[PDB]
Amino acid sequence: TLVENIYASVTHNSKNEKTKAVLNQAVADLSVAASIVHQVHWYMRGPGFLYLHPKMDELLDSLNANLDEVSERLITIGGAPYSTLAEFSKHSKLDEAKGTYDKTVAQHLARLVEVYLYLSSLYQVGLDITDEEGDAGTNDLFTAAKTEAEKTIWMLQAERGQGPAL
Amino acid sequence: TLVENIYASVTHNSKNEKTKAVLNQAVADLSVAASIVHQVHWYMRGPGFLYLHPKMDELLDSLNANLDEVSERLITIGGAPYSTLAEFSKHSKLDEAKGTYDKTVAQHLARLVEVYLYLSSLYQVGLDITDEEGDAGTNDLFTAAKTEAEKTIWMLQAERGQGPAL
Amino acid sequence: TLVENIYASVTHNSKNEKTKAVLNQAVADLSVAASIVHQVHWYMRGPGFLYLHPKMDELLDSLNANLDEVSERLITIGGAPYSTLAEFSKHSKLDEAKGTYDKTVAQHLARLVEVYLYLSSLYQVGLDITDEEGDAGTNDLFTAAKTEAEKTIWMLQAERGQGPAL
Amino acid sequence: TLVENIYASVTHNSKNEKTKAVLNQAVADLSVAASIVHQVHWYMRGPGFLYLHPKMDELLDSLNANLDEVSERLITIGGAPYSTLAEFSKHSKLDEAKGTYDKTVAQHLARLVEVYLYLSSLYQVGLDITDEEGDAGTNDLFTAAKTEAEKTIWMLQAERGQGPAL
Amino acid sequence: TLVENIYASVTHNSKNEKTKAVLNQAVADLSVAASIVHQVHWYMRGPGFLYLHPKMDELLDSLNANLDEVSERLITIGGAPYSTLAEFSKHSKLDEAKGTYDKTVAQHLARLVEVYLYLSSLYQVGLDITDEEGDAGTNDLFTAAKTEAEKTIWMLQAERGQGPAL
Amino acid sequence: TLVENIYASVTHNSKNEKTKAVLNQAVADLSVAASIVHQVHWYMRGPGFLYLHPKMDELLDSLNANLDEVSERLITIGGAPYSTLAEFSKHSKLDEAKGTYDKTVAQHLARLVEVYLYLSSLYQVGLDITDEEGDAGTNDLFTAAKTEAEKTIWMLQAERGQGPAL
Amino acid sequence: TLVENIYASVTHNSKNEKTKAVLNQAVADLSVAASIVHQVHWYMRGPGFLYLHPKMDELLDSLNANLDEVSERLITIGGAPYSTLAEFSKHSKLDEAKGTYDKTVAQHLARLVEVYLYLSSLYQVGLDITDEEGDAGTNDLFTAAKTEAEKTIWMLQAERGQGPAL
Amino acid sequence: TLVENIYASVTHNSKNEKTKAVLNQAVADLSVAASIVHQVHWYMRGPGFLYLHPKMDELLDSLNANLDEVSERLITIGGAPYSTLAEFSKHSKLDEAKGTYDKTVAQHLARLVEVYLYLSSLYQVGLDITDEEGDAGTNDLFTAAKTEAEKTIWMLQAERGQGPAL
Amino acid sequence: TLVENIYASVTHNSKNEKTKAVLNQAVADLSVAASIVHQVHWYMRGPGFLYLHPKMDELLDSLNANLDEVSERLITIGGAPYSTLAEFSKHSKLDEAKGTYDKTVAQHLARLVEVYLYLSSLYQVGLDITDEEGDAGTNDLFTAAKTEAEKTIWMLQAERGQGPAL
Amino acid sequence: TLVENIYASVTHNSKNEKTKAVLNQAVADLSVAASIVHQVHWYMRGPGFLYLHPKMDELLDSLNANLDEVSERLITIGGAPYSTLAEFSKHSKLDEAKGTYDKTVAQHLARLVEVYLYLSSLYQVGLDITDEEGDAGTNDLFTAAKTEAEKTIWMLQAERGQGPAL
Amino acid sequence: TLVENIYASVTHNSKNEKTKAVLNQAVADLSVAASIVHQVHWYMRGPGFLYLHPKMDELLDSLNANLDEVSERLITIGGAPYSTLAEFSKHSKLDEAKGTYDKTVAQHLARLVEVYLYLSSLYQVGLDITDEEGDAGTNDLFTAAKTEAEKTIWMLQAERGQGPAL
Amino acid sequence: TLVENIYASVTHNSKNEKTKAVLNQAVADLSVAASIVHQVHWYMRGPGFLYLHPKMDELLDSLNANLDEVSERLITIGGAPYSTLAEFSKHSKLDEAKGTYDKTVAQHLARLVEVYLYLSSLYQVGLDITDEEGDAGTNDLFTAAKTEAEKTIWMLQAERGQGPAL
Lengths: 166, 166, 166, 166, 166, 166, 166, 166, 166, 166, 166, 166
Ligand SMILES: [Cl-]
Ligand SMILES: [Cl-]
Ligand SMILES: [Cl-]
Ligand SMILES: [Cl-]
Ligand SMILES: [Cl-]
Ligand SMILES: [Cl-]
Ligand SMILES: [Cl-]
Ligand SMILES: [Cl-]
Ligand SMILES: [Cl-]
Ligand SMILES: [Cl-]
Ligand SMILES: [Cl-]
Ligand SMILES: [Cl-]
Ligand SMILES: [Zn+2]
Ligand SMILES: [Zn+2]
Ligand SMILES: [Zn+2]
Ligand SMILES: [Zn+2]
Ligand SMILES: [Zn+2]
Ligand SMILES: [Zn+2]
Ligand SMILES: [Zn+2]
Ligand SMILES: [Zn+2]
Ligand SMILES: [Zn+2]
Ligand SMILES: [Zn+2]
Ligand SMILES: [Zn+2]
Ligand SMILES: [Zn+2]
Ligand SMILES: [Zn+2]
Ligand SMILES: [Zn+2]
Ligand SMILES: [Zn+2]
Ligand SMILES: [Zn+2]
Ligand SMILES: [Zn+2]
Ligand SMILES: [Zn+2]
Ligand SMILES: [Zn+2]
Ligand SMILES: [Zn+2]
Ligand SMILES: [Zn+2]
Ligand SMILES: [Zn+2]
Ligand SMILES: [Zn+2]
Ligand SMILES: [Zn+2]
Ligand SMILES: [Zn+2]
Ligand SMILES: [Zn+2]
Ligand SMILES: [Zn+2]
Ligand SMILES: [Zn+2]
Ligand SMILES: [Zn+2]
Ligand SMILES: [Zn+2]
Ligand SMILES: [Zn+2]
Ligand SMILES: [Zn+2]
Ligand SMILES: [Zn+2]
Ligand SMILES: [Zn+2]
Ligand SMILES: [Zn+2]
Ligand SMILES: [Zn+2]
Known about the structure:
The structure is a homododecamer. In chain A, 76% of the residues lie in helices and 0% in strands. Chain A has a single domain (1-166), classed as Up-down Bundle (Ferritin). The first copy, chain A, is mainly α. Chain B binds chain K through residues 47-48, 51-52, 55, 155, 157-163, and chain K through 44-51, 53, 101. Bound molecules: chloride ion (12 copies) and zinc ion (36 copies). One zinc ion binds next to loops of chain B.
């Protein structure tokens, strides 16, 4: 599963080391996810743009709220968040591609769903790790982020005419 | 001057090509500037943290508003904004360093001042280019961004006990 | 007509008996209409979900405001509103079907239009009855509810690419 | 205990089947609870009506917020919520009776307390099931709903001159 | 009936003379009703004071909104509203008594119910008269005031443990 | 009377044809009335300008709210509103004159009063027609618009030192 | 002086008897003042109506706030406020006259100034009495009411082209 | 009197020494009063709880606003406020008892009235002392606090069915 | 180009004559543009209506804000704005057609894009003229209006699946 | 012209020296203008006072916002604003006279118009100077201030019954 | 003392002459104090600028609210406030110095404390004078201004690491 | 560890006895913590006071929100919260000292950090106990309080120039 792979990857490289590592992974991934969402906001063309475009700023605002919270939680528990674009891009497991206006609305929606599926799996790894290390506060952070990610998947999937398939 | 160098660099690589290039340069630089500001928000330690920390989120909100406006202006006039972290980091003329908690408040303030001085010079290049190409709307965008950057320099300089020296 | 049939049905089973009966019919029908609208809110899949889904909560809020007003009006004039789910379901003239994700957006819109057409006809019966019995206050309630129902039909019909055909 | 009986009943009829079943049970029960609360709102007579009546709309608003959240959570995790009045009434473990103006304020308060005691027990079953199946997000939903139900029991009990006895 | 008596009295002493007379009667009666409500606000003693006291200011605000609207409507249609305390007190059909702290909460509630019953009957006379004279705008004013008066009767009656008996 | 003439004119050129015609007449007249009000807003000179000028924007906002409501009501009941400036100007019974700064404040006030007197008479025709055709919803629309027009006449007349003379 | 006469009159008919008497005098006078202000609100005709009319509702709101505060203060200190229109009209030292549309704006302004001059003198008597009886709380109430009355005199006088002459 | 005893006690142990002592006495007493009010908020059982419980938080918010103001005033005039729970409890003249759920609503109301009667007497001592020492600013603070305390006594007494008896 | 033609047309028929002429041209064109937008608001049918319909009121509000600003600017600089529907319709370079429900959503979007392209070209003429005549304030007005028009073109084009092509 | 004289005067006594001088001139003049406006606010007597008086506080608020912006802009670009009353009064080109209550409303309006005409001419000098020295940000500041000054002239002139004559 | 000297000075040059003189002294001093505060706002450099700078605008807003209130009180009681910068500067007992960026934060804080100490002493003189002349309303104005000045001294002193020493 | 000691102490003296004991311990400790925070609010002197002082009221508001929630949770689950100052002071594990103005800002910050470290350890004990006893609702309460305490430690530590060291 992606969850096993994320776990393996996060814990490859102190009592809360794995929690710090998974939080930092989320710093990088939230930063890349925000960049991807912004790309949709800007490059989208097609019917529905007029409600999808502002929807991207709502998703963006939430991703950025997640980022600040995750990173401040990481600092709070004695870690050191990635804090440069090169660190985000190297450590994130999300890929980016050059923006192009010729992607269809359907392609943007599928990409967003993949981003949120990835984030929900990362957060599940965050749940497992924080349970193992006994960090209830960070577990609650990951629980809320996963729950919101899953709801977002359901809604984007619905917009695509599909079930949540999460 | 930095202004001459930015101009040379922007126009090194259609009736509004240079305006599009300078806007895109601003996309990259605003993105890196936001990242730098976030790093201060997170890594700062020292007396004054309790008002400087939320001040960074205000600066961040403004930089991100600038970014969206600049990028949508670029799209509007027929360009294609950078829209990945790797593009921001490669094309930006701002450098980033790994976050460290041992930077002093004075070092963070000096870094912010350098970022805003850089942005104000970039915007001056934007003014020259948009005047040359007759893009009044983009000229107004750069005028407001420069004016706000300059005010920010004055205030950060004041916090450092210095004059604006812009 | 549906109006004749609703009238016949309402008045089949005191100076304001028919007004009380038509108000109570509206209690049952508003309750079922709200349930139907909620089903669309939940089960819808397809392009447009992202504005249609919150639109259902707006329609729902209005139906529930109608319900409380109608029921309190009924109480106020000396009646006794239905106040259990089994009473709503037995006395309502609206049918419900088990939710299914495979209904198309077009089917949900057609169903909503039928619900509002039904409600507007019920309210017309409410107008006739309250005029006959001289209840100006309840007549005004039905007038506003009918007017809002008719506007809703026009807008939902427009979303379907059709005229109001009311 | 009621908790054992609810569990037995929910799980009588895939990795998250029991979580889906308990969420759907909550759909039905929240719907019936809202109906019961509305009946108090409408039929109550006696000293205190003027603050108890609007209190019922507050309880109602919260029950309806719970309903939408529970049902959207159910959809999100791959289930299918009850979405007709006949399904709510058949599957709910709460009974309803015909409204009557001759119930005393004390009887309405006792009924509300029983409804919330039932809901808190249902949510405890939701906690057990979501812990067993590893659904942290749904566990958090049930935790918050139980906590709010318990607080509501304490306050309604206090209004009756009694301790929470939960 | 009180309605017949109010009508007789109003029309005892131009195309809209009776509408003007009934509006002016409402000026006087709303003014006295407000005074009565204020007396309850001030003189009430007993359990429930803490929600009944502010409830009187809500009733008062509505009565005063009614007064201004009625009086401006009267002016608008070519009449001349009573506009002194002696005119209100002489022409009103409501009686006042000296305030006393020894009235019970039950007595205040009964008095308020009588005031609103009187006002609803006056408004019914306003409905009959405005229908007869073809003043739709003033008819709508009386319809809304009657509907609000009737709702108020239902709620005050409920607080007394009684049905609306309107 | 003007009312007879408006009626004759509206019904000169289906169960609700006259209601549709009178609504469409209101579309044209509201559009011209708004234009006239705007002309006062712009061209007025004289003492009182500083409260009369913003008063024109309030009158304008209300006229435009009326216009949208009337036109959407017309659409809702199966008609087709005028929707070009040439249609408004040809079908409106209100005349316009070229703006001039030499009109006195008194002349602007007299003109506004004539506009509102005209609109109130048109709305009376709307009342008669909607009563005849049994359109309660449109009757309520015209009732509220007439009532507001009449109040506006009273206030503008008062500003002129005159009675409503409606 | 009017102050001597008010004092004589108030104290003509326990440790705080005079404070209670002066507060009750204010109950009656505030009630009559509000009635007078309302009469101006309704009957005024002439240039300036459009800002003077809403100004009367502001003055009215303040007078009614004064009334409630004065009367609740009276209750609080062990008195019994006038609470019927006949008591207000008999005990007030302000006279009322039948409303007439032929009063000029200048006459309304002069009347308001006389009302406020009277109230400020009454409040001065309230200051003297509360100082004599050692009621600091009621003294503060009268101080604020006098200060506001005096400011109102200055502004109304200014509108008349006159100095405060208080 | 209690006032004489408070004075004696306050001034038992510089130009404003007595003002500082009475302010500090208020620090201690406001702190204990807040604790007592909180105890009612938590331990109350009986009809009326649902409006009395939030009423305690309003009383609490005001007591805490008083506390901060009194203590900052004390600091401002050169004193040193009590600032530990042991100082509040030792120096306050209010007694506390262990919370118990078996106190009746009537007992809680009587206790609150005693607390406010005590506070109003303390504030009267504050008035006498600040007058004697010429501290107008602190006199105004005590005047407003006494006036609010007295109003609170009137309202709580009314809820008990009694007059203010202050 | 359209820009050359608008210029030629505006300046065909004092130090700021051309600025006044171009502002007045904008008065006429903004008025016709608003009418066209309203026609879309009313006549549109098809999927997307539910977000496109309110989008038209946003566009309308902005066009009307532009109109008032342009016209007040014209007055301010010594001109005389068109202020009748016949002047708007004769002098505007925008054509209108009778509303019809059979236009597709795509046709409405194309028409809006043409309107905004026209307005942006008119504003460019306004920029050239105000630069030539040295009217910086009016130049700023046209700059902001052009920038907003261009952004609107980009967004409407995106909704059509197209690039801005401005 | 006044513009030539202001220019001569400003530049009588570094790359942005003239921009700094004109900004500082505006510091002094805005300060004196605010003082003049305050004098009207206080000393005015005559019909219209009740809307003109609060209008002066609006003008005052804007002048003070201008002052802070101008002065902070001056600081930002490396200057040193006047910051004492004696500097404002010596360097301002506006004269003040002792307040007197015998100035007519017409005299106050004429004085305000002269103040704003002066300020608009000063801002024109600011435009010329900032264009010459290439300070786009300060040019934008002067453009907005001039545009607002000109609008204010138009409105005050209108209140006087005159055209803008700017 | 400064209080004796202010008194002597104020009363050196009718029943309320001294109250008018002390109010006018406050007009001049508040105006100079505002100017001084503005100078700190602009010229400050040093750590803490970022919270001290906006703190100056808060102090400024309060000083300007004081100024308007004092001056309107003076007008209200029959005086004539200073209303030119030259009058403020001549009659104020506060001195100003040319702004300079080389003042330290500590120097600005000490200066502000001296300004507020001066104002509190002036207000004490206002208290003595208004007590002597029996002007309770103006006494209350000075009491509130003194109390606020004293609190401000305490807080600024605290920022300096000092006690209030008032 | 402190956690072991708190646990030992809490459980030294029914299915949820330990949860009730730890909640009650939090009642006492939150009450003492609030008192300590208030002492800093009042007694602090030194640079930074102007942002640290209001920061204490924010911390205080949160501590008091925690207190009410904890205590109501305790009541809700069948316990009895401490509710007198003597109980808080005896049972709290936090010590208080007499306020003194000579504590440095650094000492206040260190004390606050110790308070929050203590509270976070107490909440960890609350987590362990609620997990052991199966109280998910109280576990969530302690999780949120711990998370907020930890964030507060990070920020206060940062203000001291230190890492969170939690
Ligand atoms: Cl890296
Ligand atoms: Cl690249
Ligand atoms: Cl049934
Ligand atoms: Cl079923
Ligand atoms: Cl009479
Ligand atoms: Cl036509
Ligand atoms: Cl009497
Ligand atoms: Cl002690
Ligand atoms: Cl023409
Ligand atoms: Cl000088
Ligand atoms: Cl002088
Ligand atoms: Cl104890
Ligand atoms: Zn956008
Ligand atoms: Zn955006
Ligand atoms: Zn790395
Ligand atoms: Zn933060
Ligand atoms: Zn942040
Ligand atoms: Zn690249
Ligand atoms: Zn939803
Ligand atoms: Zn929903
Ligand atoms: Zn049945
Ligand atoms: Zn209700
Ligand atoms: Zn309700
Ligand atoms: Zn079933
Ligand atoms: Zn009250
Ligand atoms: Zn009240
Ligand atoms: Zn009479
Ligand atoms: Zn305007
Ligand atoms: Zn306007
Ligand atoms: Zn036609
Ligand atoms: Zn009115
Ligand atoms: Zn009114
Ligand atoms: Zn009497
Ligand atoms: Zn509570
Ligand atoms: Zn509470
Ligand atoms: Zn002690
Ligand atoms: Zn619409
Ligand atoms: Zn619309
Ligand atoms: Zn023409
Ligand atoms: Zn004023
Ligand atoms: Zn003012
Ligand atoms: Zn100088
Ligand atoms: Zn600033
Ligand atoms: Zn500022
Ligand atoms: Zn002088
Ligand atoms: Zn404070
Ligand atoms: Zn505080
Ligand atoms: Zn104990």
